[PDB]
Design an enzyme around this catalytic site. Sequence first.
Site, short mmCIF file in Angstrom:
data_model
loop_
_atom_site.label_atom_id
_atom_site.label_comp_id
_atom_site.label_asym_id
_atom_site.label_seq_id
_atom_site.Cartn_x
_atom_site.Cartn_y
_atom_site.Cartn_z
N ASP A 193 -1.62 -1.53 1.77
CA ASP A 193 -2.64 -2.48 1.30
C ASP A 193 -2.07 -3.26 0.12
O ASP A 193 -1.76 -2.70 -0.93
CB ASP A 193 -3.97 -1.92 0.74
CG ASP A 193 -4.31 -0.53 1.15
OD1 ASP A 193 -3.54 0.20 1.81
OD2 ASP A 193 -5.43 -0.16 0.75
N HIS A 205 -17.30 2.65 -8.75
CA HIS A 205 -17.20 4.06 -8.45
C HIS A 205 -17.76 4.75 -9.68
O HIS A 205 -17.54 4.29 -10.79
CB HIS A 205 -15.74 4.46 -8.32
CG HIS A 205 -15.08 3.92 -7.09
ND1 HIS A 205 -14.12 2.96 -7.11
CD2 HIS A 205 -15.25 4.26 -5.79
CE1 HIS A 205 -13.70 2.70 -5.89
NE2 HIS A 205 -14.38 3.48 -5.06
N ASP A 221 -15.25 5.14 -12.29
CA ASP A 221 -14.73 3.91 -12.88
C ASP A 221 -15.38 3.70 -14.24
O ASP A 221 -14.72 3.31 -15.19
CB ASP A 221 -15.06 2.69 -12.00
CG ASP A 221 -14.29 2.65 -10.69
OD1 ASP A 221 -13.21 3.26 -10.57
OD2 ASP A 221 -14.77 1.96 -9.76
N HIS A 235 -7.81 -3.46 5.65
CA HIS A 235 -7.93 -2.22 6.40
C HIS A 235 -7.84 -2.51 7.89
O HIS A 235 -7.18 -1.80 8.64
CB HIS A 235 -9.25 -1.53 6.08
CG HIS A 235 -9.34 -1.03 4.67
ND1 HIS A 235 -10.42 -0.33 4.20
CD2 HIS A 235 -8.47 -1.13 3.64
CE1 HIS A 235 -10.22 -0.01 2.93
NE2 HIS A 235 -9.04 -0.48 2.57
#
Lengths: 443, 443, 443, 443
Positions: free
Chosen positions: C306, C100, C103, C270
Site C-alpha cells: 500500500d 482509531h 490514535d 486494497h
Amino acid sequence: AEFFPEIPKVQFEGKESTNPLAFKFYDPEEIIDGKPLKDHLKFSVAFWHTFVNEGRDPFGDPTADRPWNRYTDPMDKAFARVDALFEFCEKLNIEYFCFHDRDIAPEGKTLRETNKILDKVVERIKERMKDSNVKLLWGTANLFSHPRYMHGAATTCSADVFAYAAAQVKKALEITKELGGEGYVFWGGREGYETLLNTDLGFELENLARFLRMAVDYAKRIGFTGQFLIEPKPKEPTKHQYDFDVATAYAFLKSHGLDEYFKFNIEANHATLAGHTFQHELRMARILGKLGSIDANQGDLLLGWDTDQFPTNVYDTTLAMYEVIKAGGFTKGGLNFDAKVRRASYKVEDLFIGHIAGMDTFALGFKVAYKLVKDGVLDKFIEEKYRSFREGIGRDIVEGKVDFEKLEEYIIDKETIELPSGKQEYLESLINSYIVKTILELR
Amino acid sequence: AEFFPEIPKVQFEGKESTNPLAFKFYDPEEIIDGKPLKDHLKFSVAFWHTFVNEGRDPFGDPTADRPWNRYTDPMDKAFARVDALFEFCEKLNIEYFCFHDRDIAPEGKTLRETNKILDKVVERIKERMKDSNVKLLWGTANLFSHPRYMHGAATTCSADVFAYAAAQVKKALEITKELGGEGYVFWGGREGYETLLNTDLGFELENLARFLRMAVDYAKRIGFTGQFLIEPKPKEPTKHQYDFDVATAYAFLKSHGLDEYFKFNIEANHATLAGHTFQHELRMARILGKLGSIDANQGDLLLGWDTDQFPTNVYDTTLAMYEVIKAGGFTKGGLNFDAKVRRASYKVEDLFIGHIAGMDTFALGFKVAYKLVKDGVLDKFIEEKYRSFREGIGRDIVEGKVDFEKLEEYIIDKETIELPSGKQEYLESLINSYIVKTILELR
Amino acid sequence: AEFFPEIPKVQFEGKESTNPLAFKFYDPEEIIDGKPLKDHLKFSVAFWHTFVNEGRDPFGDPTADRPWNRYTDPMDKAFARVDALFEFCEKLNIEYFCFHDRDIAPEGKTLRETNKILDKVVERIKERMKDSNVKLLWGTANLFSHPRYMHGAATTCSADVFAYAAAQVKKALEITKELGGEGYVFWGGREGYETLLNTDLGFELENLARFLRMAVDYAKRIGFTGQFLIEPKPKEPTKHQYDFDVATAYAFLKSHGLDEYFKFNIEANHATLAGHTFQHELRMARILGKLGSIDANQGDLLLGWDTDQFPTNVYDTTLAMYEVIKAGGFTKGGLNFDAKVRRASYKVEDLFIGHIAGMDTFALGFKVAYKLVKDGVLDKFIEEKYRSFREGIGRDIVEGKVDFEKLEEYIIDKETIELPSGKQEYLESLINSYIVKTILELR
Amino acid sequence: AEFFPEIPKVQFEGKESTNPLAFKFYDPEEIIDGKPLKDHLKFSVAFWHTFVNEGRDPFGDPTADRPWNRYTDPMDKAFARVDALFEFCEKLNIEYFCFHDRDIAPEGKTLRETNKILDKVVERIKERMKDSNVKLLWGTANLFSHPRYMHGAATTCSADVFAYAAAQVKKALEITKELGGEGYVFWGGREGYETLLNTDLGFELENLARFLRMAVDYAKRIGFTGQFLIEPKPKEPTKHQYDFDVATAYAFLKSHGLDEYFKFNIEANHATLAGHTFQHELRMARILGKLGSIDANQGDLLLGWDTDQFPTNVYDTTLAMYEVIKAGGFTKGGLNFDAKVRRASYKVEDLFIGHIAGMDTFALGFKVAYKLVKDGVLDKFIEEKYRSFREGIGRDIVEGKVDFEKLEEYIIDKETIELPSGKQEYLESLINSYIVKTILELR
Ligand SMILES: [Co+2]
Ligand SMILES: [Co+2]
Ligand SMILES: [Co+2]
Ligand SMILES: [Co+2]
Ligand SMILES: [Co+2]
Ligand SMILES: [Co+2]
Ligand SMILES: [Co+2]
Ligand SMILES: [Co+2]
Ligand SMILES: [Co+2]
Ligand SMILES: [Co+2]
Ligand SMILES: [Co+2]
Ligand SMILES: [Co+2]
C-alpha cells in the site's frame, strides 16, 4: 472503397464531435512550429496486428471479420492484404506502416523459394507505394514464429538455425533498404531462455553479439542508412528475454562495443511488464541519447501478459510525449501502433475506431506535453530543487574541486541541514491543471 | 552464557536429529577438498537484523524479547549488543559478521560527535574480536535511515547532504579497514526516485558516479584492500532504485568506467523483486566476473515487498550454490544472513532456530550442487546441446570466418533443419534425483 | 490560526486557478439536485495519517515537521492533536473525521487505565465538536499495532487476547455512539495468517464469526444505530488477510448469517492489491447492496505494497463515483481520505496541498460521472447489448419457462448466430469525451 | 506399440534409477493402508494438452512431432487420437483420462451435425474402454474456444448463445454419464469480463446461476450421479473471471443456493495466479467440505500467465497432498495432469518424460505428507498453540457462555498477557526433515 466500402476517409470533427469515425483531437493538418501535426506524431500502422491478426487467443479461435478472408489461395490473400493496407492508411490518414518479412508473404519449402515468393509481394507493395504517400517507417525479420527458432535465433544451439537467421535478416535488410525504411528493428522474441538448466548464458550472449555486428557490417556493405533499433521486452514468450529493458540491452551493447550503432524502440506494454513505467523507459533511452522510436500501445497493469491495447489514457500519452518533445521530437522514428482490437471488437469498423482512439489520445497528450514544456513549469521546479549544486561547495563538487577529505572538513560540524519538500502531490495536481488548460484551448 | 544462558553452543547431530538446536546438515568441521565446510560457506551474521531489529512492521510495534532491552542508556545498549554479538557467533559457530556504521553506535548532534561516539564502540569490538575468532566480512554506511537522506545520498538535491554522505562513507571505509573487513558494500537504499516529475535523472546519475569514484580514490589514499561491492535492489523504499539489478548496475558502472573496481553482493529477495530468479542474478554476476558475495535470505514470491526470511528451500540453495561453485567458490565474500525472524517468532531461541535452519539448508544445497558439478551431469547435456558450433560452419561462425553472404550461400537451399529437444522436464527431474542421491550419502 | 498560522481557510478559485492552496474543481457550496456539493462527497480526514503519522517508512526515520512535536508529554501531544484536527478541518473545509481509539489517546498499563486516559481526550473532542461543525463519520478499534495482537485479535490463539479485543471493541463502540458516528469499521489487519503450518484455519474463522456477532449483539444492547462496515484487504501486514476482498468477506458473512448486519468500506489501494480494479470492487459491493463507504486513496500498480497516496487521477475518480451515483449516493458513509503525504512532502503545507488535490480530483470525477449517468450514454449501450433477453426465447429463459430440453429443441438446427461487437475501444474514447465535455462546463 | 513403438510400458525402477523412462518414486502397485498406491493418487491424463495440443504459443507455430499428424482427414485424426490415448495410458500406467467434448470430435455446421459426428467418436472410445481398464474421471464442455462464446456462454449477451451453450452442456452431461464419468467440470473460461463499461455484472451473474441450476435439474432428469465440479480461475483469457477462486465461487453458489450440489476442482497455476498458494486454496476447499478434485500442474510465480508445467517440486506436492490426506483422500476425483510439455520439449518421448516426472513428484510428496500426518507432528504443535481455548474462559468463549461485558470484567485489570512463539522457522525446517526421513525409507 473496394475493401472497406462502408468506411469513408476520416476527417477532423473537433472536441465536441460525437461521431465515432471522426478525429476529436487529431487534426493531421494543424501546424505547430512550422510543421503539420502529422509530422510531429508520425503515426504508423503495424501490418501484423491490423492485417494478419484475427483475434485468436490461447483459449479461442479467431473472431475477426475481414474482407480478404474469402481468398483461400495464400497468395491471393497476401496481395489482397497489401491492397487493404493502402486503402486503410488512406482513409485513416496514415503515412507510415511497419511490417515483418513473414507478415507480407507466405513461406516456401526452402529459403530460396521463400525469398522468390517474398519478392513478388514486395514489388506489388512498391507500385502502390509510389502511387500513394505511405512510407516504410521500419522493417524487421520475424525470427520467432517458425519452429526452427524454438531455441532462439542468434542464441540458438544449432548453427544451421544461426545461418538461416543470418540469411533471413540479410534479405530483410535488403527489402527494407529497397522500400526506403527509416529504420530496421530487432525484437529478440526467442532470444532469451525458458530454463537456465539447459542454457549456456555466456555463449548465447556471445553469438547474439556476433550476429548483431554481422548485421551492422552488411548494412554497410549495402549502403543502408536506416537507424538500427533494438526493441526491449522482459519476457513472453520466453521466461527471460535478454534485452530485458533499456538499461539491460544498453549494458549488453556497451559491453560489446555495439552501442554506437543502435537506438531503442520503446513499447509501453513492454516497459510495464518489466516493472517500469512507460515514462521511465523513455527517459532512460533519452539520457542515453537512444530514444529511437515508439510502439504506441497500452497494457493492463493488473494482467501479467501483453494485452497490446490501443492507448486511451491521456496521463500516459502526456508523460510519453513529454519525453519525446524533450528529446527533440522524432528523427527516424514515430508512433507505430503496435496494438490490436479486443477479440470481441471483431468488426471492421472497430479496426478504424481503435486506431482513431489511439491517435486522438496521443494527439491530445502531445498538446498537453507541449504546454508543460513551453511554460517550462516542471523545468523551473527542478532547476530550483537542485539549486545548491550551482552555488558554493555544490559547484566545487560538480566541477571536481572537492574530495572526501575536503568534504569532511566542510561538513564535520554542521548541525542542521535544510531540505526542500518533494512536492509530488503538488506536481501531480499540475498535470491535471494542464490537461484542463489545454482542453479549453481545443477546437 | 551471560546473555543467552539457556542456549548451549550448537553442535552437529546428523540427518536424523530431532533437536531444534542442532545442525542436521551443517558440520562446520567436515573437510571437502582440503577445506573444512565452514571455509566453503563463510556464514556471517547481519548485525542489523539480529541485534538491532525487534519485530516492528509498518502496522505494528516491536515484539522481540531481547536481553539487552533492560539497558535504557543508549550507550549501555550499544555495548550490550557488541557483547551479545560475539556470544551469539560463538554458540552458533559463526566466524563472520557484517554491520552498518549506524547499527553499532548511536548518533550525536554533529558528525564529529557521532564519529567520537562511534570510535568508543569500534574499540570495544576490536578487543572482543582479537579475544575471539569472528571477523568482519564487510562493512557499510547506512545512507538511508536518517531524514537527511529523504531525497537520497549521492543523488540528493542538497550539496550539504552530498557532503555529509561523503564524510560518513569516509569514516565507514576507515573503520572497515581497521576491523579488517574483506569488503565494503554500497546499498543505494535512497539512491533512486519516487517520482520522475521532480527528478533530474541524468544529474543524479552523474553525482552518483562522482561519489563512487571519490570513494575508490580515498580507498587508495588509505591503502584499503577490501573488495567494493554494490548490492542491487529494484525498489523499496523507493519506487525505482538505480541499481535495479546486476545488468542495470553493470550498465552504469561500465558506462562511467567504474566497473573494474566493483563486484556484486547478490540478495535472493532483491533478485525476485526485480522479476528475476536468484540463480539468474548469480549467473549474470558470474559471467561478468563479478559474483562478489551473497546475502542469504528468501523472499515470498506471492508478496510484493522484501520479507527477508531465513532460507529453508533446498531447490534455491542448490541452484545458488551451483553458481558459486562454478564461479570458483568465495574469495572476499560469503553467505551473510541478511534475514530476520518472523514478528511472531519473538523469542530468543527463534533467533538461533532461524539461523540454524538457514545454515542447514545452505549446507545441504552446497552438497547437492557439489555432486551436480562433480558428476558434470548438466555440463555434459549443455556441451552436447551446442555441439554444432564445434563442427562445420558452426566453428566458422564462432571463429569469425563467416559473414551474412557466406551464410546465405550455405543455407539458401537447405530444406529441413534438425533440432534437439530442450529436455527441461528431464533436467528438472534430475535435480530431484541428485537431492535424493545426496541425502542417502548424508551422515 | 494557532497551529497552522501560515495557512488561510481554503476557498474555491476555479478551473484556471494557479494558487496551490485553492480548490480548482471543488466548490463546497455548489448545489447539485438540491444538495450542496459537500453533501454528495462527504469528504473526511483520517486522524491516523494526518495527525499521528510522521513519514516513517521501513527503511527510514520520520520526516514530518509538525507543530505539536514540541510537546514531549504524551498527553499534551494528544490534546494538541485534537485541537489541530478541528483547525485543519475548518481551514480545509471538511466536516467529517475518522479515528482509531489508539490514535487519540496513549495507552496505560491496564485496560482500565487506558480507558480512563481515553475518556479524557474523548471529552475534549466533544467540546470542540459542538463548538464546530465537524462530525464523526466512523470510528474503529486498532486491533493490530500492539504486540498483544501479533497472532491476531479475534483469530488469536490466546483467549486472553480474544477477551482484551472484545473489551476494546466494546469501548470503541461506546465512544463511537457517544460521538455520534455514522458507522463503525472493522479492519482485520492481523486477522489472517503468515503461514498455514501453524494455522487452524477453520477454528480462527469460527472465533472471528463469534466475535463479529458478539459485537452486533452489544451494539443492540447499547442502542447503537451506526452502520457496521467491514474493510477488506488481501494482505499486508499478513501474508493472507481473511477479508481478502468483497466477494471473500461476503462469503464468510453470508456463510455465518452475519451479512444482513454489514456493509463494506472499500479502499482503492486494497482493491488493486488483491488484483482487482477499484471500480470492480465498488460494483460488487453495489450489486450485493453493501456499498457502505469509501477510503479515498490511490495505490501504485507497479508496487506490491500500500502506497496510500492522495488520489490525483480523474479516470479512477470518475469510475469510482459512477458506481456511487448508481448506488444512490452515500447514506451513512463518505470519502474518508485514508491517504498520506509522501515522506519527502514533509512540510505542513503539503498536508493541505495533498488533501486539496484529492478533493479536486474527486470533485471533478463526480461531475464527469454525473454527466455519464444523466445522458445515460453507457446505460443505453448496455440495454441494447443484452436486448435479446427481452424478446423471444431470451425472455422465456429469464422468466424460467425454458429448460435444457426446450433449449436443445430451439437451437438444434440454427446454423449461424449473430453477435454484437463489444465496442470497448469505443466506450473508452467516450470516457475521454465526457472528461472534455465536463471541463468545458467548469467554472 | 503401433503409435509409440519406441516407448515400452513404464515400470518402477527405484530411487537410484537413472533411466528417464522409469518411475523413481511411483510404484503403482505398492499398497498403503490396503490400497495400491495407484488408488490413492488416481492419476489421469488431460486429452487436450497431451493429444490435441501441439506447442503453439501466441508468438509461434506448433512444434510437436506427433504420429497422428499424417492423417489430414479431420475424422481419421480424431480416431487416431482415441487410439493413441489408450496406448499412452497403457504404457504410462494410467487408468483415468479427462476430455472436453470438442477435444474428441470436430464440429459440424449445425449442433445436430456436430452431435452426430460426436457420437461416432464416443462409440469408438467406449469399445477401446471396455477392452482396457482406463476410465473417465470427468468430462466437460468446451464453452470458450468457438467465436460464438466471445462474450461468454451463460454470461453472454445473446440468448441464442445461451441456448447453444445449454444444449452443448446437455449433450456433454449425456456422454459423460454414458462413459461412466466420476464428475462433470465447469470451467467458466469466458464467464467473466474484459471491461466493466459494457458489462451488466448483476444480469450476467443471474444468467450464470440460472444456467448452473438448469444443468443440475437435467442431471437429475437423466439419473447422472457424477460430482459437479467448478474449476476456479482468476483471469486469462478474460480480465476478470467470475469464479475468481474458492471463496469467490463459494460466495456465488451459497448466495444462489447452488452450493450443496458443487465441489471444487483446484488447479495449482490458477491458485497462484489469483495471488494464493496451492495449499491455501486446497485448505479453503477442504474446510468448506468441497475439495473435489485436483488439476496437477505447476505455474511459474515470476510469470503472469498460466505456464501449465508438469509438477516437479516436492514442497508443493507435499503440502498439496497433505491437504488431500486430511480431507480423507479422493472420492470422485483425482490428480488430472492438466499440464503440457514446454514448446521445445517437442519430441514424443518428452510427453512420457513429462508425465513420469509429475507422477514421481506427486508420489514422493504423497509419501512425505503421509508421514507428517501419521507422526501427527504438525497437528500436535497446533493443538498446543490454541490450548487456551480448551481451558478457562477460552472454553466459555467457544461454548458461548461469554459476552463482551463478561469479557471486559475478566480482562479489565490483567496487566501482562503471555504469548507463544509462532515457530515458523522451526516448522519449515521440519518439512525438510520429513523430506529427508522419507527419502531414507524409499526403495
Ligand atoms: Co479492388
Ligand atoms: Co508487444
Ligand atoms: Co512492438
Ligand atoms: Co556478561
Ligand atoms: Co534486503
Ligand atoms: Co542485503
Ligand atoms: Co491554540
Ligand atoms: Co490501506
Ligand atoms: Co482504510
Ligand atoms: Co494401430
Ligand atoms: Co489452467
Ligand atoms: Co484445469
